[PDB]
Amino acid sequence: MRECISIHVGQAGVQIGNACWELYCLEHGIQPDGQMPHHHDSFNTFFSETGAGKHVPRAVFVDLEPTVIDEVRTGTYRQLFHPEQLITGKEDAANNYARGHYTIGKEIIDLVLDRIRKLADQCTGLQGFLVFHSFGGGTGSGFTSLLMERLSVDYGKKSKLEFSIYPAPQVSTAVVEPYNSILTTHTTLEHSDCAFMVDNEAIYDICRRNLDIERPTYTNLNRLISQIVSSITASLRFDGALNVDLTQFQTNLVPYPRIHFPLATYAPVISAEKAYHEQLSVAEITNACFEPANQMVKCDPRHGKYMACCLLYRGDVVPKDVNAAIATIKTKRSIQFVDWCPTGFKVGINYQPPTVVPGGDLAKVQRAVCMLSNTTAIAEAWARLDHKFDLMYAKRAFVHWYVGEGMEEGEFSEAREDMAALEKDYEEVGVDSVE
Amino acid sequence: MRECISIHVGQAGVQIGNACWELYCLEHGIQPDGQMPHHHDSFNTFFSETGAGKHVPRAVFVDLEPTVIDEVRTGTYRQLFHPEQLITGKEDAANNYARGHYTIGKEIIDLVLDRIRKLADQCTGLQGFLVFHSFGGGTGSGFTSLLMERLSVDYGKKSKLEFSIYPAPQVSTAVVEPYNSILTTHTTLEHSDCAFMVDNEAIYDICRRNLDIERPTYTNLNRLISQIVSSITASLRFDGALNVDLTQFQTNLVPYPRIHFPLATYAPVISAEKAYHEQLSVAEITNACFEPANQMVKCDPRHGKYMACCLLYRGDVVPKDVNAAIATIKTKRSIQFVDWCPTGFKVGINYQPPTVVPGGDLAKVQRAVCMLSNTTAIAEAWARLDHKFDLMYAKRAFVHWYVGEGMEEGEFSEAREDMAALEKDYEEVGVDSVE
Amino acid sequence: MREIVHIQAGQCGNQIGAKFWEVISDEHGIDPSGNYVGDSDLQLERISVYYNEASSHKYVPRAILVDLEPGTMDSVRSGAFGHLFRPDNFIFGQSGAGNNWAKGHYTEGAELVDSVLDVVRKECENCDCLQGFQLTHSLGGGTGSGMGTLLISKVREEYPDRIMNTFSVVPSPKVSDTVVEPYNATLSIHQLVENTDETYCIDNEALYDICFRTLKLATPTYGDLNHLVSATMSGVTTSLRFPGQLNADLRKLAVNMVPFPRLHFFMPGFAPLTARGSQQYRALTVPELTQQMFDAKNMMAACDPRHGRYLTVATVFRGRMSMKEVDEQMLAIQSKNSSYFVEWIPNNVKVAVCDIPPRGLKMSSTFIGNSTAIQELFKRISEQFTAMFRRKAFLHWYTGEGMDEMEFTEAESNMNDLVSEYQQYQDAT
Amino acid sequence: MREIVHIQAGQCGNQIGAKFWEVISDEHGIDPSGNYVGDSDLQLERISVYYNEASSHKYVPRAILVDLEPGTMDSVRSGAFGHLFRPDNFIFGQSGAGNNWAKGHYTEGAELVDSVLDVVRKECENCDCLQGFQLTHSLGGGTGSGMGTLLISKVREEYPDRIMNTFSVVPSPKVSDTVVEPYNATLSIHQLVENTDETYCIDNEALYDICFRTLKLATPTYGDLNHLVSATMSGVTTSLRFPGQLNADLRKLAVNMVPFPRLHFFMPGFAPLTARGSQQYRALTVPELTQQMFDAKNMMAACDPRHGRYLTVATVFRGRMSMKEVDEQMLAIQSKNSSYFVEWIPNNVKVAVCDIPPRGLKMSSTFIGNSTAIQELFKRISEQFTAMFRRKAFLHWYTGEGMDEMEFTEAESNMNDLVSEYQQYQDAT
Ligand SMILES: Nc1nc2c(ncn2[C@@H]2O[C@H](COP(=O)(O)OP(=O)(O)OP(=O)(O)O)[C@@H](O)[C@H]2O)c(=O)[nH]1
Ligand SMILES: Nc1nc2c(ncn2[C@@H]2O[C@H](COP(=O)(O)OP(=O)(O)OP(=O)(O)O)[C@@H](O)[C@H]2O)c(=O)[nH]1
Ligand SMILES: Nc1nc2c(ncn2[C@@H]2O[C@H](COP(=O)(O)OP(=O)(O)OP(=O)(O)O)[C@@H](O)[C@H]2O)c(=O)[nH]1
Ligand SMILES: Nc1nc2c(ncn2[C@@H]2O[C@H](COP(=O)(O)OP(=O)(O)OP(=O)(O)O)[C@@H](O)[C@H]2O)c(=O)[nH]1
Ligand SMILES: [Mg+2]
Ligand SMILES: [Mg+2]
Ligand SMILES: [Mg+2]
Ligand SMILES: [Mg+2]
């Protein structure tokens, strides 16, 4: 009845999406082939119904380099996706934002838009867009800015949430990461309602320490991030004692037009052997999720102050001890909120316990918590990325690749002054002021 | 309800705790795996209930060398302890107090505090801490004085009992014992409410003579000391016609803040064949425990005077012959008390007869007594230990290991004058005063 | 005769109403299928006030369930007790208000109000003689607060010579469910004070304490929390639903309680509240009933009366008692607790007695006290709203959908005036 | 009518009371479930004095059991005779006082004293006339002595025109149960002699000797010990629970036996005390009963009367007799033992007779003597306290939780004054 479409860009988006649609299909009791062996609508919001028993997702997989899509085409989930939806290019942007936004990215944007328009007109209660893209990648960063500009032009006012992958401070995979990230943030700063961040090693620390796995391939990392995404949407898909809508997330988490960069967190993340020796109480998972070491971004919240928080409990949850738990959290010393926000908690409860993917690293739990924190500890991460970009650009390194591919040094100057304005606003808002 | 957490430190603490925690599950009818075949709570003071039928102990095993803990992990009690609780270092302190308190001990003390704070917040009515640490070792003495500093600041005024292992007069497994013992006693003097002393050689005489055992391995010695620990906390876990608490012990046995060094004593300790020829009456186990040869510390009470006592009966005990027995004990000329304490007895009765571990040397008894004498006779033991420390330190022997590990020669003077103050204070109040 | 119209807005209204119409069905002996299965004809004596006669002796409630987000309605429709409602009444929108006043008053308020007003008019014309309106909503949400204000206004020009009772769940001091509460509350209260008759403020954590402490419930869920507030709500009405020895009606309560146009914020309370195991050791008698009502602990609003003075007080008994025992005890209460009553209204106790006891109880009572302890509730909310607004936080999304700063300035000025008059009358001589 | 409130503090009070309500239940014919199963109608003539009538003829005792630790209530609640108390009364803390005055009067007591006091006011609002408070506690423990005195000072503020009796358990001269007895006891008495009307001092070894030689028991547990003190405690009260030829009550005893405000420490006693085997060799008649009580052997306080003189004496008979035989013997006792009575109180014998015999006995008696021999008990306690205080032993943990040096000086300064007047009046001419 209320519909939201999902756009996956780059290899990161496709690989995450493969793990995300892994779990949505499991949550709704749908076999991989589209058939089936609370339940009945729910699946109408994501899985459009064909006349037969087959369900097809509202997913738009787009990439320029075709090897990753050829994997998902030949994967186990071959019969689920609509064959028209999988859009492939011929060569990728090669970590060049200029290529992926000006030269080659403009020659396929018309095809993806037409598939978006066809899918949106198919639905009747369109709500918003879910974008799964990374930041370092040339096509992930290059395409997303083009799509945000194109989608916002077509649809005037709709919720536009993005599940990005924040670049790390010591873990690195590209060499032009400071160039791609700064360009991406500046262009999409005005066309993103709420963008979640995730750091790769932060899950690696979590997977190594909390769950004790010494072989965390990208499959295990994708499984953890996939769990956060579903339970955020699970309020729309499922009934609950206190339902929270996509606008409710967007309204309750964004205090300012520019400060719309929260971070995600999930709990409990414990293993199978340690499951027996734990009681899984509501009072402690509220404490466990809020613990600084469990945050899924490589930033310590103790270095800053929270500004707004949002909790989502699902399963056998009573609103009383949930009420009690937040009361003790608020009075605790380590947690400090900002002065202009005497109240900083939004609570949503759902009756559906989370499901477990077969063969997963996590253990079955009857209660789950997902925490979305908009804080100021993110500001220290922006300054660090700004420092890296300023160091590299100080002597015009790699600019010849960018300039030759349809840019000018003037555009780099404007993006630099833009991030200075965002950082100066973030610190001045977080810092206290008299009167 | 009423909660107390147990910290096991060094090889002595882990080895004692293996036998000690073996007795508690026997008392509460807990199988080694966790299931079960007076009874209703009771186990809530030591066994934190998981949602299922499994019970997990409220114990924290900490060590710097992984040889002994790995035995606990691989032992028969493998499924009981919480796997996170077993904290291991990488190398031991190697009988160096400086190492376990300054250089290597400091780098791990933050990890154990995290599990202490997490476990304390889980419980509701925490009272105090039980510490099972030795004196001659490196981690058992150096690291435990750090824990007292860490625990005391977090919890201002709570009960803190250390079930120490007093170094023996002539038996000496280590060579730097006088250097270790003097240093740890000085720092823990002001942060210990009630410290129990035990001598390893004293039990050996008890086991050879009274128990008639010629192969008293450390497993046989540890079974007998475990009974003293169990009956001290037998009042919290079980009802009684005259109950005592952690505080009741702690205020009835400490006339002065510095003089808080009692010594344990258990009765009856008799063999299986000798059981038939003994009628095991209340009027004689009171007399048996008061005999000088049954004391658990190698110090004859005749050389000194008792200052305060504490009896703890359990089983088919009636109060009429109890206070009758003490009445005859008081008038006896062999036992002498101090003038300023006209009354020096405290009693506690329980309806639970002590249990016997299978295969143990002790026989089944329907009555038991534990005597906790705070006496001046232990002052002779401090003088002997101070004599050894003063002898070797005179020419500065073995000091180069300590000095190069984060100490100063001046610091040794403070610990020397500290024991000078205590040794005379113990005598000066023990001896009569003018007017 | 004297028919009553029941309106529901927001998620709370539908959940409270789900428990509400459960209580009424047991009171009137109504099967879930909708057919009479009871015995006494006394229930049939006045059945048209809430229910409606239909073909083949069927009964349908006079309820109008309406909320922007559809999610609540699939629960009430698919769940039990959904075979007796009127399918036309099941009004729902497309997208929830998103905890926004603007989306509940200007964007989605337009198209939904026209539809719901149509069903009100048809329901009113079917009615023989209208008595008033009943609206259950929350002051913290977007749809319930935002649209409920719009509905209260649109109804008001349509029926000037009528009364309505709004049973609103006023936000809590200790715990706040949503981050932007003060913006929705302050705007909502300004409109309600303008164009409403009476308002029963109710808290959540105060009813949390009552369930945990008095009833000794370890896990108080929304099922038990809403069950208690329904019993108070059923008790208020049962004066005209059922015969009694000293009858009262919604018109009687409104005039006895509201001395001034701007002072109409009440505080309810219910008694007895006893656990399942501890009911055998207590004597069900009027002395303990009135004592149980008149203590701060057994109060459904989180405001201790000891910091203020009771302006007026009501008491709607149920079951069989003596007027002597009832009014002798009101004397004992008044003499002993005289320091807590306003001096310049004498005899400020209104008492009504019914004859049909509540289910599973020998007798019960409902206490509605218009006190001066609300001044501490409005003072706190105004403080929270002030600090948030001065730094201009969250404002871009109320300005971006219709409003501007003049609405916020005037709402704050009016709320300051109301708490000024509320205090200035308490401290009058 | 003339109801009294029963308060239990400490472990002893709970243990004594647990068996005290045993004997009271048999007297009134009460089944352990709580329903009347007796035969004679005279039992219900005055049943409201102790028990409380409730729904379906169930009776609930007027008891308030409070302890700072949960180790005591676990026994009474889970054990038998625990299905008839009201669970609201079962007040308990979290950690015991630990044989400390400070942890029961300053630090830990204040937290829980507000809860029990609010129950006391709520306890017998149904109760229509207070006759007094009955308190059973110990003078050696922490919670029994510490907060028990705290309750006395606070309760006395709310009910100043009322009389209460505390049935304390005064410490022993041979064997001491706790090491720090004199600090706990002396600090308690300095507050007791100001806010109480009369105190019944009871020892334990004197109870041990009686249960050894007279009752022929070699191993008397605490069950067989508390049964002896319950009968004495039930004997004092039974005057106003049952009809009698010469009735008495709590107020009557206080007038006869408190000649001066500070001299209100009594010494009880019971008779007959005979073994089951040797019960056939004695004729149950008044002659031996009066002789049995007046010897030093059958006395519940370990203080030999021969070193002092009786000031005033009670003899609350039970069963049935002729007052002539009663006063024929009180004459014989007076004439033959005239050297053991004070000169400046003529006819210092108070006698009351009831009509209901104790269970399984033709006749019995209770002796209460405000004797002067108590002066030797307080002399010994003040001797032990003096020796400990100059050395400042055990004192570093009293000033550390609220007290100081000056408080201890005044408590002993007042106590030596009390023993001064307790003897100066004996030798007064
Ligand atoms: N969490 C997660 N991150 C991934 C995964 N795969 C790639 N990434 C991130 O994606 C970044 C690589 O850029 P991509 O967006 O994948 O670029 P691409 O899809 O190969 O296409 P081009 O940008 O044209 O090279 C790396 O820095 C990784 O951090 C994955 O499986 N899981
Ligand atoms: N009663 C008893 N004492 C023991 C036992 N094992 C070791 N000890 C005592 O422990 C002392 C040795 O020092 P420890 O405290 O064990 O030192 P550690 O735990 O090995 O740690 P390091 O000093 O770093 O090597 C000896 O003097 C023994 O008296 C035991 O099993 N039972
Ligand atoms: N008494 C009671 N109050 C509730 C219950 N459920 C929610 N509430 C309150 O109602 C408020 C929810 O706001 P609503 O008006 O229902 O919002 P909604 O129906 O989800 O739709 P939106 O306003 O668009 O978000 C919360 O602040 C809660 O305090 C309930 O079951 N019982
Ligand atoms: N007559 C009688 N006296 C008892 C009994 N049990 C304990 N006592 C007395 O009570 C005293 C114990 O102190 P309590 O008042 O019970 O102390 P508590 O209630 O345990 O609380 P704390 O003082 O904090 O430990 C002892 O000196 C005993 O003489 C009993 O069963 N019968
Ligand atoms: Mg690629
Ligand atoms: Mg070692
Ligand atoms: Mg809603
Ligand atoms: Mg106690």
Q: What does the H/E/C string look like for A148-188?
A: HHHHHHHCCCCEEEEECCCCCCCCCCCCCHHHHHHHHHHHH
- Give the three-class secondary structure for C142: coil
Terminal alpha carbon distance of chain B: 48
Phi, psi of C87 (to 5 degrees): -60, -25
Structural contact between residues C109 and C403, judged by C-beta atoms closer than 8 angstroms: no
Residue B404 to residue B386: CA distance in whole angstroms: 24
**CB-based burial label for B411 (10 Å; 0-12, 13-18, 19+):** middle
Q: How many CB atoms lie within 10 A of CB A223?
A: 21
**How far does CA A199 lie from the centroid of its chain?**
11
Residue D222 to residue D215: CA distance in whole angstroms: 15
| Mutation pick for ligand 4 pocket among D91, D138, D145 (CB with most ligand atoms within 8 Å) | D138
Residues with beta carbon < 5 A to ion ligand 6?
B 11, 92
Cβ–Cβ contact B54 with A under 8 A: yes
Q: What does the H/E/C string look like for A17-60?
A: HHHHHHHHHHHCCCCCCCCCCCCCCCHHHCEEECCCCCEEECEE
Phi, psi of D12 (to 5 degrees): -60, -50
Q: How many CB atoms lie within 10 A of CB A104?
A: 22
Do you find a cis peptide bond into B169, omega within 30 degrees of 0?
Answer: no
DSSP secondary structure code for residue C309 in this structure: -
Angle between helical axes of B409-430 and B177-188 (0-180°, round to 10): 70
Residue A147 to residue A145: CA distance in whole angstroms: 5
Q: Is any atom of ligand 4 closer than 6 Å to the C-beta of D100?
A: no
Structural contact between residues B40 and D78, judged by C-beta atoms closer than 8 angstroms: yes
Q: How many CB atoms lie within 10 A of CB C245?
A: 14
Do you find a cis peptide bond into A257, omega within 30 degrees of 0?
Answer: no
Q: Which of A386, A391, A350 is nearest to A369 (CA)?
A: A350
Q: Which of C18, C80, C29, C64 is nearest to C230 (CA)?
A: C18
- List beta partners, residue D63: D6
Tell me the two tokens of residue D245: 């030829």
Structural contact between residues D256 and D163, judged by C-beta atoms closer than 8 angstroms: no
Biggest alpha carbon distance in chain A? 65
Residues in CB range of A5: below 8 A, 6 or more apart = A58, A59, A60, A116, A119, A120, A123, A126, A129, A130
Q: Which of B201, B208, B28, B62 is nearest to B139 (CA)?
A: B62
- List beta partners, residue B126: B3
Q: Given strand D310-316, what is the order of strands in its sheet? A: D349-352, D310-316, D369-371
- List beta partners, residue C63: C6
Angle between helical axes of C143-158 and C10-27 (0-180°, round to 10): 70
Name the residue with tokens 């007042």. D414
Structural domains in chain D plus CATH codes: 3-257 (3.40.50.1440), 265-374 (3.30.1330.20), 375-427 (1.10.287.600)
Q: What is the resolution of this structure in A?
A: 3.6
Q: How many CB atoms lie within 10 A of CB B129?
A: 24
B287-313 core/surface letters (b: 16 or more CB in 10 A; e: else): ebbbeeebbbbbbebeebbbbbbbbbb
Cβ–Cβ contact A273 with B under 8 A: yes
Do D60 and C287 lie within an 8 Å CB cutoff? Answer: no
- Give the three-class secondary structure for B398: coil
Residues in CB range of B426: below 8 A, 6 or more apart = B259, B376, B378, B379, B382
D251 CA distance to ligand 4 middle (Å): 29
Tell me the two tokens of residue B277: 């020829």
Do B327 and D396 lie within an 8 Å CB cutoff? Answer: no
Q: What is the CA radius of gyration of chain B?
A: 21
Q: Which of C299, C298, C265 is nearest to C371 (CA)?
A: C265
DSSP secondary structure code for residue D277 in this structure: G
> Which residue has a Cα nearest atom 1 of ligand 2?
B200
Do A274 and B83 lie within an 8 Å CB cutoff? Answer: yes
Exposure of A73 in the CB half-sphere (CA atoms within 13 A): 14
**CB-based burial label for C306 (10 Å; 0-12, 13-18, 19+):** exposed
Q: Is any atom of ligand 1 closer than 6 Å to the C-beta of A11?
A: yes
CA distance C381 to chain A (A): 11
| Residues in chain D, overall count | 429
Q: How many CB atoms lie within 10 A of CB C242?
A: 19
Residues in CB range of C281: below 8 A, 6 or more apart = D54, D58, D60, D86, D87
- Please give the method by which this entry was determined: cryo-EM
CA distance C281 to chain D (A): 6
| Mutation pick for ligand 2 pocket among B8, B11, B61 (CB with most ligand atoms within 8 Å) | B11
Residue C244 to residue C36: CA distance in whole angstroms: 23
- Give the three-class secondary structure for B387: helix
Q: Which of D38, D116, D17 is nearest to D356 (CA)?
A: D38
Q: Which helix (H) or strand (E) holds A122?
A: helix A109-122
Tell me the two tokens of residue B214: 């010629």
DSSP secondary structure code for residue A317 in this structure: -
- Give the three-class secondary structure for A129: strand
Residue A242 to residue A235: CA distance in whole angstroms: 9
Q: Residue D141's closest chain B neighbor by CA? A: B248
Of C280, C282, C291, the CB nearest to D125: C291
Residue D353 to residue D326: CA distance in whole angstroms: 9
Tell me the two tokens of residue A169: 């401070």
Of B56, B83, B121, the CB nearest to A273: B83
Residue D160 to residue D156: CA distance in whole angstroms: 5
Name the residue with tokens 């114990």. B59
Q: Which helix (H) or strand (E) holds B131?
A: strand B126-132
Q: How far is CA B297 from CA B171, B429, D142, in A?
A: 13, 22, 32
